[PDB]
Each structure stands twice: as structure tokens, then as C-alpha cells.
Design a protein around this ligand. Structure first.
Ligand SMILES: CC(=O)SCCNC(=O)CCNC(=O)[C@H](O)C(C)(C)COP(=O)(O)OP(=O)(O)OC[C@H]1O[C@@H](n2cnc3c(N)ncnc32)[C@H](O)[C@@H]1OP(=O)(O)O
Length: 151
């Protein structure tokens, strides 16, 4: 699939906000957006068929060891454009960037009943490494897996 990726900045931020409003249940706060922009190459908008149709947004975090890791905050593709590889293109980009920028780990939280997502991330080498009950993945407490991949 021919996907064109662009960084997120003030000038195209509203594109990401629109995608999130369609894809995710509640308004994301301004620290999500600041963290996404600050994550650099790890946050991308996807363009296909001359339209912005998806995004991946990460936060970068420093561990006490000195090591660095990537947290996937959101990954999503608009419904009419799913199943043709755009979401895989976004995640492959981020995984490649983990290696290039010497990240030790990437991880995210997935609600425990979100079988589609667990299946999706395991295809890319992720594994469940923890279970957190009543985690605030959005605004309500939900049981979640920590889903991670080590480098
Ligand atoms: C914190 C987190 O990031 S949890 C992320 C969960 N996000 C969502 O569920 C949002 C709704 N779904 C989507 O936005 C997209 O379908 C994504 C991001 C899951 C995948 O993007 P796509 O472009 O659809 O994925 P891509 O086409 O690259 O590969 C398809 C894979 O998507 C997975 N998938 C999950 N939901 C769907 C869907 N609704 N339609 C198509 N594929 C889907 C399938 O397992 C498929 O693998 P297969 O066809 O080999 O079984």
C-alpha cells in the first residue's frame, strides 16, 4: 500500500483532532497533543488517496535505568480505509524508528476484552507482559493488558 506519512505540528494538529473525535470516545487533553508532537518521528499522520485517513501518536519516556521507551497513545485508521495495510504501515514506521533511535521497548495498554487489538499487535511481535485492573485508559477504569515489544 502507498501511504504518505507526515509529522504532526501546530499547522496540521486539527487533522489529528478530527481523526480522534471520530475514532475515540472522548476528547483528548492538551498534554496528549503536546506529548504527541514532542515525540517527533514516532507520531505520524497517514495520507492515502490524497486524504488524511489515519494516525499513530506516541509519547516518549525515560526510564530510571537511563533507557528510553515508546508508549503508543493512539493508533487508528478511518473506517472506509481499513484493511488495506495503512495501520500496519503506521506501526511498521514506528517500530523501525524504535530500532533506528535505539529505543529499548515499546508498549501500550489494551482493554482485556479488545481481542481485535491484541490479535493485531501480536502480529507485529508484541506480547502481553502485565495485567492492570481498573486502569484509566480513557476516562473510565477498565481492565487492561500491558502489551509490549522489546529491542
Ligand atoms: C491503544 C491502542 O492503540 S489500541 C488500538 C485499537 N484501535 C482500534 O481498534 C481503532 C479501530 N480500528 C482501526 O483503526 C484499524 O482497523 C487498525 C488501526 C486496528 C488497523 O488499521 P488497518 O489499516 O485496518 O490494519 P491493516 O489493514 O494494516 O492490517 C489489517 C489488520 O487489522 C486488524 N484489524 C483490527 N480491526 C480491523 C478492522 N476494523 N478492519 C480491518 N482490519 C482490522 C486485522 O487483524 C487485520 O489483520 P488480517 O487482515 O491479517 O487479519
Amino acid at each position: 500500500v502507498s501511504v504518505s506519512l507526515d509529522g504532526v505540528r501546530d499547522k496540521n494538529l486539527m487533522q489529528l483532532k478530527i481523526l480522534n473525535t471520530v475514532l475515540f470516545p472522548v476528547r483528548y487533553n492538551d498534554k496528549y497533543y503536546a506529548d504527541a508532537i514532542a515525540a517527533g518521528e514516532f507520531t505520524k499522520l497517514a495520507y492515502y488517496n490524497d486524504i488524511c485517513v489515519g494516525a499513530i501518536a506516541c509519547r516518549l519516556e525515560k526510564k530510571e535505568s537511563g533507557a528510553m521507551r515508546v508508549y503508543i497513545m493512539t493508533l487508528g485508521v478511518l473506517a472506509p480505509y481499513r484493511g488495506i495495510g495503512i495501520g500496519s504501515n503506521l506501526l511498521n514506521h514506528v517500530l523501525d524508528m524504535c530500532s533506528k533511535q535505539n529505543m529499548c521497548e515499546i508498549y501500550l495498554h489494551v482493554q482485556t476484552n479488545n481481542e481485535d487489538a491484541i490479535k493485531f499487535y501480536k502480529k507485529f511481535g508484541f506480547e502481553i507482559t502485565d495485567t492492570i485492573q481498573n486502569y484509566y485508559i480513557n476516562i473510565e477504569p477498565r481492565d487492561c493488558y500491558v502489551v509490549s515489544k522489546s529491542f
